[PDB]
């Protein structure tokens, strides 16, 4: 009854066979209209952009070229397997209108097959595994997809996998269909119609070097049979994490670990489309490295894009080290960094994680990072209440110099800020008359800090925060059981008084 | 010293004038080549997309296109001014290679001119205020720009606005230059020489309405400019928040509140590059259409756009009922959803806004989504501690026909879950041997649920987890002080489970 | 059934944790799990009023010995067929804890106490 997905290919493709004996309906890509009927129309056509940067900081002789898939509707490469098979299943009569849409992926090509059913009205169903990242389940969720998840390390043959709990869905709910981008050859024909005569032309038909990381396989399986078709003195390289066994020979997945952060690549198993014969050479990666070199990207080169493009580039700075001048090398990026945002996109995760160590991150920094906030010139030596009218307080800030004043309740809470310039501004723009309360004007959002912080953690909160008040906290005791609390505002920091401090401390 | 961005344009534009007389340097939009030097050169050339379904749910007779201006290499269509600005300031001399920017934005601007800087070497600093988003802030951190907030609500005029910080900024950090897209003309020229032309060219030259929502006016400005040298015939409609005052006549501004969670448009002054004279009628928008609407083309047409998007088509489903069959209809989306993954995306952000009601939310959802849980079928017969071996639990699973069964401490605290089928997969695998424990096996990840809850509430669950574990917790007490707590699982739900319940019962 | 006593506990202690989050009534269990009955609120109140009962008496003189087990797979008609003889049904569940497929172990807890009243107000309640 169940098909696996690993199971042997029953594909006869060797090469030098002629075209005209494919089975397959290949569609020849064409020029899209000055208006597109649909957004869906907006896949391929990808740019190709030349990494200019990182080879030269890795000693690269040959010309790095990055194959842009992120900027597709979706955002990933799987967009287009997801319209090819959809327009397979269609045509072949298999898919019909309403139908129920069941597909196990990492969360792209669930994307992919959403959006489509949502132009095409389809109804969707994604099996995605837990470790994904949230911001793939809420796009889904406002695409109108039906979301399963499934254990990340259930092994793919389990009843609880997600390839096996779509199958479960399938016998259930009755009208439904699985695409099976493991084992549907649209997969990798999208692939080798679109992506490498897109690669060719753009390249004008000479490229020496081809890296691309492997999930599914298509993408690298019909791109390497395309161009061994075409250009033969291509190398072809695939990418596969540790804890993975698609890259061979097996000596290279010798590892404790089968658990891996980096998404949409790597598997338990060797999918049916996944051709490993036209694979030149192998190499694996870790996540570390995959997210230095994604951050560098996005640093030094503006590419957004994720990890697995991370892990692509850092594989090709190594293969293309057998290259000379002249010659030519080629990386695919799947995926853009909207899926990523809370990941290594941000610095408290990678820290949590440990991809980051605290001597890395501040060996960057200025002299005066580790600085603590006590050394600068702050004073605060008023406080208003917040029932003082405007007017009030325009006295007693003109008569005394001071353009600004925190704002305290009779308890010592603090409420806020206030400034003389905004007052003057609202009183001549008539938003508050002089006898109104500063209540209407004062700045409710400030950050607490305390003297011992250092420089650093002040401006990472001034990335948030206009105002940072150095807060003090006093705790005053009766007899160990009647405890109170006092606080007081010492000095408002901003950007303009640090950067004053930096520049003055500097000569 | 301080040039304010709200003085009068000094602009001697005017319909029929020849551009012969423009002092301004006009770039001619060109063929880029089929390998781009650098990420910059893949902006303009956007899609033009056709609006589907929300016309007819609208009535709209006329036909309505989607400038979808958010496929930029920053994602939004403030990279095309920022490449401008940069690009004529290299020109003029006025900036110099190693410089410092500093721009006062909403954060799009400050993305586009980040990527720009990182991309040719310029120091970027980013004067945001603190309502936008913070996704746009770790962008901007990951493209290595430093980030200065101000208080939401401080007047233009006032000395801690963002147009002031930055002023205040560049009178202080030596060689800084501010492109203050407020005032510069490069902001609706790239428009009036580009986004215009491509609209022209996409349309055939015959477009009778054009709706934009009105930021810093150059959008608006320089398509409205140029259409009416063209096409004199089309409508321009702009679209300004509520608590704006860009909307003119002052009548529609009437308004008590001047907070809106919208990002990127409208503002308390009128900037200079925006020009209302060539704008025919105006539209105030409100927070909650707008981000329905977004949702609504999220969900309906796979445009992943932002809320200012929202308000674009919210306007224009009213705008164009003027319009008849034969007629067209154009609308610009500025940005895309990655700035807003925790905002409006977000159901629980909108429902703490209130921008969502509980009635509307499950008034679509289906009959079963208000069952508790104590109507499905579930039960946990048994349960095994963590230290129990792999051969052993597959024999007391087999020998009573269970599948699964959960993993309990000796105190009663929940481990995680086991499967039958799991386990026989790694024993063939050999990644266990039937004498090693099952904790190498368990799954650690798991989600609490009460019988009281929901079926919508254990769907939600599960769209994050695959197992919804029936938990309940008894308190044991012996004198008031001395209290324990006991718990016990009772059913392991899936989404399996659920779907077949609802099946069965659904007949 | 939120919360339960031990039989040591004392009247007035029980008096206080009741009325502090308004349950009428507790099941009584033993340390190792073992249900030895139930007690209510308002037994505690008119018998420590009659004199019964101290306020530092153990709850074991108060409380309700005599009580019918049922399952939540359960029909309705078989409960029905239990209060007639029987005043409390208490839902009981139980989990076989396993060891080594030879020490195998039992637990079980309370979670639900119905009588002919609340049987009588369900159905009246879903009679719609
Ligand atoms: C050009 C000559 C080709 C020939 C003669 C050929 C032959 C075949 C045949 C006969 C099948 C059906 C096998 C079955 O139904 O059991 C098949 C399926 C398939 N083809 Fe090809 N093929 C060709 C090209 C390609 C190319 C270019 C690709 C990918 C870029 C491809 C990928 C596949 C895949 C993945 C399957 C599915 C195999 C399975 O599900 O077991 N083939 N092929
Ligand atoms: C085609 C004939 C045009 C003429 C004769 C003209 C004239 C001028 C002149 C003389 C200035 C400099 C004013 C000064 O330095 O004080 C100026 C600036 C400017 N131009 Fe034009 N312009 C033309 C077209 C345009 C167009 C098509 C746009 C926008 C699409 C535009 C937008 C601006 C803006 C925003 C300024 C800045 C004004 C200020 O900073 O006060 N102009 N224009």
Same mark, same amino acid.
């Not at 690993?6 to 290919?9: L, R, V």
């Given at each position: 009854l169940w098909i696996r997905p +690993?199971?042997?290919?029953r594909c006869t493709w060797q090469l030098g066979?002629?075209?005209? %004996?494919?089975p397959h309906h290949h569609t020849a890509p064409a020029k899209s209209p !000055? &208006? =597109?009927? $649909? &957004?869906?129309? !907006? &896949?391929?056509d990808t740019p190709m952009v030349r990494i200019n940067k990182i080879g030269k900081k890795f000693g690269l002789k040959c010309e790095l070229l990055a194959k842009? *898939?992120?900027?597709?509707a979706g955002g990933s490469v799987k967009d287009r397997i997801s319209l090819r098979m959809i327009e397979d299943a269609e045509r072949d009569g298999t898919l019909k209108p309403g139908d129920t849409i069941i597909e196990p992926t990492s969360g792209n090509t669930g994307i992919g097959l959403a959006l489509a059913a949502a132009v095409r009205g389809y109804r969707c169903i994604i099996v995605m595994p837990?470790?994904?990242?949230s911001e793939k389940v809420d796009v889904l969720r406002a695409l109108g997809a039906e979301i399963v998840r499934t254990p #990340?390390?259930?092994?793919? +043959?389990?009843? %609880?996998s997600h390839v096996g709990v779509a199958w479960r869905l399938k016998n259930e709910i009755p009208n439904s269909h699985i695409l099976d981008q493991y084992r549907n050859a649209s997969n990798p024909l999208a692939h080798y119609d679109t992506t490498a005569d897109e690669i060719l032309q753009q390249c004008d038909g000479k490229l020496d070097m081809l890296v691309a990381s492997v999930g599914t396989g298509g993408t690298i399986t019909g791109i390497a049979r395309k161009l061994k078709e075409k250009c033969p003195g291509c190398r072809i390289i695939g990418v596969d994490p540790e804890?993975? &066994?698609?890259?061979?020979?097996? %000596? =290279?997945?010798?590892?404790?670990?089968? #658990?891996? *952060?980096? *998404?949409?690549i790597g598997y338990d198993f060797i999918p #049916?489309?996944? +051709?490993?014969?036209?694979? $030149?050479k192998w190499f694996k990666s870790n996540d570390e490295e995959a997210f230095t070199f994604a951050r560098m990207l996005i640093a030094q080169e503006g590419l957004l894009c994720g990890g697995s493009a991370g892990s692509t580039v850092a594989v090709a700075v190594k293969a293309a080290q057998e290259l000379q001048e002249g010659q030519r090398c080629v990386v695919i990026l799947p995926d853009s960094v909207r899926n990523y945002m809370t990941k290594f996109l941000s610095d408290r995760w990678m820290l949590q994680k440990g991809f980051l160590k605290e001597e890395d991150l501040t060996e !960057? !920094?200025?002299?005066?990072?580790?600085?603590?906030?006590?050394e600068l010139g702050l004073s605060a030596p008023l406080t208003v209440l917040p029932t003082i009218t405007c007017g009030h307080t325009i006295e007693i800030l003109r008569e005394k110099g001071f353009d600004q004043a925190p704002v305290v309740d009779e308890a010592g809470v603090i409420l806020g800020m206030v400034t003389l310039g905004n007052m003057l501004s609202s009183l001549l723009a008539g938003k508050?008359?002089?006898? $109104?309360?500063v209540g209407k004007v004062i700045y409710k959002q400030f950050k607490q800090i305390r003297l011992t912080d250092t420089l650093g953690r002040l401006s990472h909160i001034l990335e948030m925060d206009h105002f940072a008040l150095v807060v003090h906290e006093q705790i005053q005791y009766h007899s160990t059981g009647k405890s109170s609390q006092r606080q007081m505002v010492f000095g408002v920091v901003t950007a303009i008084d640090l950067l004053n401090f930096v520049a003055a401390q500097e000569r």
């Open positions: +690993d199971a042997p290919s066979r002629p075209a005209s %004996e494919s !000055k &208006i =597109l009927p $649909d &957004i869906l129309k !907006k &896949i391929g842009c *898939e992120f900027f597709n837990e470790k994904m990242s #990340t390390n259930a092994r793919f +043959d389990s009843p %609880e804890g993975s &066994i698609l890259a061979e020979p097996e %000596e =290279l997945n010798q590892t404790e670990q089968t #658990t891996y *952060e980096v *998404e949409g #049916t489309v996944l +051709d490993r014969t036209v694979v $030149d !960057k !920094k200025p002299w005066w990072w580790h600085l603590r906030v006590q508050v008359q002089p006898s $109104d309360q």
